Amino acid sequence: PLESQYQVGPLLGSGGFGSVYSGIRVSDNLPVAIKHVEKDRISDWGELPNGTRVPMEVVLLKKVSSGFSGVIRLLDWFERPDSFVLILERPEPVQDLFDFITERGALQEELARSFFWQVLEAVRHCHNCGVLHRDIKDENILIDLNRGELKLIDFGSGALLKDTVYTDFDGTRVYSPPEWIRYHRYHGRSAAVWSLGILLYDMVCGDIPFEHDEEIIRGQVFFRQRVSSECQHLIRWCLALRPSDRPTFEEIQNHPWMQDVLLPQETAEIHLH
Ligand SMILES: Fc1cccc(F)c1-c1ccc2[nH]nc(-c3cncc(O[C@H]4CNCCC45CC5)n3)c2c1
């Protein structure tokens, strides 16, 4: 079942998401990632078209898993007595964006643009498929270093997308919007756009803009690195205090800072190889 089909490799890491291992699919030597989650730690359950009780993460991944490569593909999954196991794709060589930024510091704007654009395409794809990630951040983005392609990972804090208010949140606090901090209420799209402003700031400054609740609520952005005025403007727009003042995905991608994006392969050749 799981035992024979996959050869298990080293532990890649563990956290709120559970424990993830490197691995190889025995049949064709396909590189994979093997993710284990205990049932006790799963608060958010969902149901398949089969009518089967699984972790919401499995529901969400199946809804977004198609030829589009901006989201990590779910290859298979298994239930065990006290856990679920997910077999996910694994690009090779790969590095998560948090580690990449830690090593480089602030990213050049051309590179940040390419990366941010790909994140946007991936988030739009999720939203089109009825899925809200709810934990967009550097740690949850992988870079395929050869192709220069980014992938979203870890849908364990996600939800079905809806147009009504959310009153639960389980993502990362420092990426969460002021309406959550103050009222424990938010809407999907506008909260996602706030997290994208935090992410963009992180890319171009090398760290997140806010640490404490009061800074989030105050929403005053200070630039610690040299950042173009157009990029500063896009960031401040994404981080508007009122949800309804934030741009739509379309407005973000039509913003002047976002024009003439590099292709992924060009991005790898210039910045990654
Ligand atoms: F294979 C890898 C090597 C180095 C870093 C990586 F992130 C990976 C990798 C490759 C394929 C993957 N598919 N899914 C994951 C995954 C899923 N959920 C969580 C998660 O967390 C990792 C990324 N941020 C830091 C913590 C982490 C354990 C290392 N990865 C995945 C990861």
Kindly state the tokens that stand for 149. Answer: 């392609």
Rg for the chain (alpha carbons), in Å?
19
Q: How many Å apart are CA 231 and CA 226, to the nearest integer?
A: 10
Amino acid at 148: G
Region of residue 130 (left: phi > 0; alpha: psi -120 to 50; beta: else): left
Is 19 marked as a binding-site residue?
Answer: yes
The topology (CATH level 3) of 1-92 is: Phosphorylase Kinase; domain 1 (3.30.200)
Q: How many Å apart are CA 57 and CA 48, to the nearest integer?
A: 11
Please name the residue whose Cα sits nearest to atom 31 of ligand 1: 33
Please name the residue whose Cα sits nearest to atom 22 of ligand 1: 13
**Distance from Cα 81 to the centre of ligand 1, integer Å:** 24
Instruction: Name the phi and psi angles at 163, rounded to 5.
Output: -95, -5
Q: How many Å apart are CA 172 and CA 115, to the nearest integer?
A: 20
Contacts of 128 (CB under 8 A, 6+ apart): none
**Distance from Cα 107 to the centre of ligand 1, integer Å:** 21
Task: Answer whether 178's CB lies under 8 Å from 238's CB.
Answer: no
Is 18 marked as a binding-site residue?
Answer: yes
Task: Answer whether 57's CB lies under 8 Å from 41's CB.
Answer: no
**E strand map for 103-257:** 131-132, 141-144, 149-152, 159-160
Amino acid at 78: F
Q: How many Å apart are CA 202 and CA 97, to the nearest integer?
A: 10
Catalytic residues: 135
**Distance from Cα 87 to the centre of ligand 1, integer Å:** 12
Region of residue 203 (left: phi > 0; alpha: psi -120 to 50; beta: else): alpha
Which residues, in sequence order, are bridge partners of residue 149? Answer: 144
Query: What's the order of all strands across the beta sheet hosting 141-144?
Result: 94-96, 141-144, 149-152
Kindly state the tokens that stand for 95. Answer: 């590095």
Which residues, in sequence order, are bridge partners of residue 46? Answer: 54
Give residues (CB < 6 A) around ligand 1. 12-13, 15, 17, 20, 22, 33, 35, 72, 88, 90, 94, 96, 139, 142, 153-154
Resolution stated for this PDB structure, in Å:
2.2
| Domain spans in the chain, listed from the N-terminal domain onward | 1-92, 93-273
Query: What's the order of all strands across the beta sheet hosting 18-25?
Result: 6-15, 18-25, 30-38, 83-89, 74-79
Task: Answer whether 83's CB lies under 8 Å from 233's CB.
Answer: no
Atom of ligand 1 nearest to the CA of 32: 11
Choose among 6, 1, 2, 3: nearest CA to 29: 6
Pairing state between β 141-144 and 94-96:
antiparallel
User: What technique was this entry resolved by?
Assistant: X-ray
Amino acid at 95: Q
Pairing state between β 6-15 and 18-25:
antiparallel
Ligand 1 pocket test: which of 6, 8, 11, 12 has the largest number of ligand atoms within 8 Å of its C-beta?
A: 12
What does each C-alpha distance from 130 to 2, 125, 163 come to in angstroms? 30, 9, 11
Helix H or strand E encompassing 15: strand 6-15
Is 15 marked as a binding-site residue?
Answer: yes
**Distance from Cα 142 to the centre of ligand 1, integer Å:** 7
Amino acid at 234: L
- How remote is the C-alpha of 71 from its chain's centroid? 9
93-273: CATH architecture: Orthogonal Bundle (1.10)
Tell me, yes or no, if the two domains 1-92 and 93-273 fold the same way: no
Amino acid at 214: E
Is 17 marked as a binding-site residue?
Answer: yes
Helix H or strand E encompassing 88: strand 83-89
